[PDB]
Design a protein around this motif. Sequence first.
Motif, PDB file in Angstrom:
ATOM      1  N   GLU B  10       0.852  -1.232   0.000  1.00 11.29           N
ATOM      2  CA  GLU B  10       0.000   0.000   0.000  1.00 11.29           C
ATOM      3  C   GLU B  10       0.862   1.247   0.000  1.00 11.29           C
ATOM      4  O   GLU B  10       0.487   2.331  -0.448  1.00 11.29           O
ATOM      5  CB  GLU B  10      -0.880   0.154   1.237  1.00 11.29           C
ATOM      6  N   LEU B  13       2.442   1.551  -3.732  1.00 17.96           N
ATOM      7  CA  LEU B  13       1.394   2.151  -4.541  1.00 17.96           C
ATOM      8  C   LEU B  13       1.260   3.634  -4.333  1.00 17.96           C
ATOM      9  O   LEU B  13       1.231   4.300  -5.344  1.00 17.96           O
ATOM     10  CB  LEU B  13       0.112   1.442  -4.223  1.00 17.96           C
ATOM     11  N   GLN B  17       1.911   6.443  -7.271  1.00 22.69           N
ATOM     12  CA  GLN B  17       0.922   7.416  -7.760  1.00 22.69           C
ATOM     13  C   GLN B  17       1.438   8.835  -7.503  1.00 22.69           C
ATOM     14  O   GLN B  17       1.140   9.751  -8.283  1.00 22.69           O
ATOM     15  CB  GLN B  17      -0.384   7.248  -7.054  1.00 22.69           C
ATOM     16  N   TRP B 109       2.685  -0.594 -13.159  1.00 24.20           N
ATOM     17  CA  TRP B 109       3.134  -1.083 -11.870  1.00 24.20           C
ATOM     18  C   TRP B 109       2.122  -0.736 -10.825  1.00 24.20           C
ATOM     19  O   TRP B 109       1.974  -1.507  -9.901  1.00 24.20           O
ATOM     20  CB  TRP B 109       4.520  -0.536 -11.511  1.00 24.20           C
ATOM     21  N   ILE B 110       1.434   0.417 -10.959  1.00 21.41           N
ATOM     22  CA  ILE B 110       0.389   0.884 -10.053  1.00 21.41           C
ATOM     23  C   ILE B 110      -0.645  -0.235 -10.209  1.00 21.41           C
ATOM     24  O   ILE B 110      -1.069  -0.743  -9.176  1.00 21.41           O
ATOM     25  CB  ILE B 110      -0.124   2.214 -10.543  1.00 21.41           C
ATOM     26  N   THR B 111      -1.042  -0.687 -11.398  1.00 26.67           N
ATOM     27  CA  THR B 111      -1.991  -1.749 -11.437  1.00 26.67           C
ATOM     28  C   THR B 111      -1.422  -2.982 -10.754  1.00 26.67           C
ATOM     29  O   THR B 111      -2.120  -3.508  -9.892  1.00 26.67           O
ATOM     30  CB  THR B 111      -2.353  -2.193 -12.794  1.00 26.67           C
ATOM     31  N   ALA B 113       0.594  -3.451  -8.111  1.00 28.84           N
ATOM     32  CA  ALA B 113       0.498  -3.348  -6.660  1.00 28.84           C
ATOM     33  C   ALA B 113      -0.947  -3.419  -6.288  1.00 28.84           C
ATOM     34  O   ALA B 113      -1.255  -4.204  -5.398  1.00 28.84           O
ATOM     35  CB  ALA B 113       1.119  -2.061  -6.176  1.00 28.84           C
ATOM     36  N   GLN B 114      -1.834  -2.787  -7.066  1.00 31.88           N
ATOM     37  CA  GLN B 114      -3.268  -2.811  -6.791  1.00 31.88           C
ATOM     38  C   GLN B 114      -3.727  -4.206  -7.008  1.00 31.88           C
ATOM     39  O   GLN B 114      -4.561  -4.612  -6.217  1.00 31.88           O
ATOM     40  CB  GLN B 114      -4.152  -2.033  -7.696  1.00 31.88           C
TER      41      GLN B 114
END
Lengths: 121, 121
Positions: B10, B13, B17, B109-111, B113-114
């Motif tokens: 978390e 991420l 962002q 990469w954001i996707t 970790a999500q």
Amino acid sequence: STKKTQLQLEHLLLDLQMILNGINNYKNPKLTRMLTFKFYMPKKATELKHLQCLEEELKPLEEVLNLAQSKNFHLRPRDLISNINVIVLELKCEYADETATIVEFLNRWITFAQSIISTLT
Amino acid sequence: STKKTQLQLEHLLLDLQMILNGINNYKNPKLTRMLTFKFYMPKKATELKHLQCLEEELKPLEEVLNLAQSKNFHLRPRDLISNINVIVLELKCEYADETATIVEFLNRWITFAQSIISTLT
């Protein structure tokens, strides 16, 4: 600023020397064909403003580096070309008639990088 | 434990962002030029050992961030890079052929970790 600028010129320098050690060797089997590509040379290259002349030849430099074996380079070539592209954009054309080889072109900018440093010392 | 992993993921991420926000905005006049720097994507990023493929692109990402106007970032770019680094180290490379921009790169990469977070809750 003696330190932001010399710090970037000694870092430009080593990225360029690291591209030359990469192409320049017996473990590089296409050296002879790389040697036939044309690189343009700056008539004058006396100030940092003249880095535009290196900036302009960076995508020719990347296309021909595709002939080189990634393995004999110390940094992935991709990194070396990004590093030099960020330093020239952060530091900064009259070309000469007779064109040059990749090894004369790299050697000529290594020499200008060493030259400005010696003014900033 | 799973709460420690949930918690470092978390954290990655938001650091990821926050970089996307400092880049992706109109107060950053270097956006179009930073979009021409090339980034490697992984063939698949399905598990945490695949954070190897982010670890490797981190020193290009730091360098291109030097083109960004630092005031648009919520935390110093350095901080963002250091946190992403000690967390990829705490937490874990087949690339892909089409290269990608800093915005698609930060975004895949954001996707990832999500998507991992969703697997643990």
